[PDB]
Ligand binder design. Structure first.
Ligand SMILES: O=C(c1ccc(Cl)cc1)c1c(-c2ccc(O)cc2)sc2ccccc12
Ligand SMILES: O=C(c1ccc(Cl)cc1)c1c(-c2ccc(O)cc2)sc2ccccc12
Lengths: 154, 152
């Protein structure tokens, strides 16, 4: 049993590494790292609800959009965490690139990210991304509200 | 042996931290090293708000019990890692928010916590969430990214 779990964790780690280092035109094939019904997307949004892309095929189609709106995106400072579940990994990293959203000025986006990767049979079943949307607001020229700090300890 | 022993003890401390509620929050700083750091890494400013030192952490807990008087963490999932001294926690949290100068409200959010250990106690705790939900709980307007040109 431990041999099978050990093997799964070593294999899944290699897929996480591959995912995190995928840049440029290779992003068009990142969806092959997922199960046929795998889900990926952004769990921290302006609205409160995740924006998730469901299915390997739709993930490949979303990649076409991503190469237009995040044309040169890179993940940096990658730290991969194995867990007691051989099929569950977390990643702490940063990310950076141009942001080219419709109807907004071209900007430069930088942020800190946490990723969750859950695996089934050697491929990604669920990827979720967590960040602070305030930095994406700033990259688009959108005003970020401020919590008044006068009454807080300081 | 040395790594295994550390991880089992450290997991107990993470569990204790995440289940500390009510007046026991006033003693939660005793789970940290003398120079331990805790705080919020996802803010409105872009910089962390970190509380530095076990003594300042205990002082901050007094403020926290006033402003989050009934706070609980829920849906707690603790992740050990290949570092026996590094743990991650996925959870939710909820309770009243009583912030200076804002209407009393109810705050609910999803959280990730990072716990790094030194010699049996927490050296660094970091909390990550979506500040837009805290804005909502305070009655602060959340900006909206225009979707019109985005796939839907
Ligand atoms: O970057 C993103 C985003 C969301 C989900 C994914 Cl999978 C990737 C980027 C965001 C939006 C988006 C929605 C639909 C769409 O097809 C493309 C982008 S809307 C919004 C709002 C706030 C923060 C981030 C985003
Ligand atoms: O809840 C918090 C917060 C920040 C740090 C900790 Cl340790 C706990 C709560 C926030 C602020 C705060 C700053 C100083 C202070 O002594 C008390 C609160 S300012 C702000 C801004 C946006 C989101 C959350 C917070």
């Amino acid at each position: 049993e431990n041999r099978a779990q050990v093997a799964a964790r070593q294999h899944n780690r290699k897929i996480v590494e591959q995912y995190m280092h995928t840049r440029g035109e290779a992003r068009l094939k990142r969806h092959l790292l997922f199960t046929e019904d795998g889900v990926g997307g952004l769990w921290t949004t302006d609205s409160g609800q995740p924006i998730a892309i469901r299915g390997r095929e739709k993930l490949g189609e979303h990649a076409v959009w991503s190469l237009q709106c995040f044309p040169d995106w890179v993940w940096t400072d990658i730290q991969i965490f194995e867990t007691q579940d051989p099929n569950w990994f977390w990643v702490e990293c940063r990310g950076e690139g141009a942001i080219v959203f419709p109807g907004y000025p071209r900007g430069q986006y930088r942020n800190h990210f946490l990723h969750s990767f859950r695996f089934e049979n050697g491929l990604i079943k669920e990827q979720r991304e967590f960040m602070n949307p305030c930095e994406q607001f700033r990259s688009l020229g959108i005003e970020v509200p401020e919590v008044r700090r006068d009454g807080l300890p300081s």
